[PDB]
Amino acid sequence: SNGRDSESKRLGAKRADGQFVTGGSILYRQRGTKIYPGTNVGRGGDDTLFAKTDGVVRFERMGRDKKKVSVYP
């Protein structure tokens, strides 16, 4: 009848604001853009936000109902 679940996928954040981060690092795993990609940041096929250059993470607001993440050296 019942009793099956799936393996959890370790979503969420993986680096902190103020944390230096090397390029290619994963910053936020997600489904969809619960966090949009920002400056020096991409979004992968599975919607993961990763850094493109070496820098320092920063979470920042877009307009009210949305957020992004950026990387600034």
Q: Between residue 2 and residue 31, which ones bind RNA under the rule CB under 7 A?
A: 2-14, 22-26, 29-31
Please, where are the H alpha helices in 1-73? none
With contacts defined by CB under 5 A, how many residues of the chain interact with Mg ion?
1
Q: Would you call 51 helix, strand, or coil by DSSP?
A: strand
Site for RNA (CB under 7 A): which residue of 18, 19, 20, 34? 34
Cβ neighbour number for residue 37 with a 10 Å cutoff:
21
Stretch that binds Mg ion, among 7-15, 26-34, 45-53, 61-69 (CB under 5 A): 45-53
Number of residues that bind RNA (CB under 7 A): 38
Q: Evaluate whether 57 touches 19 at the Cβ level (below 8 Å).
A: yes
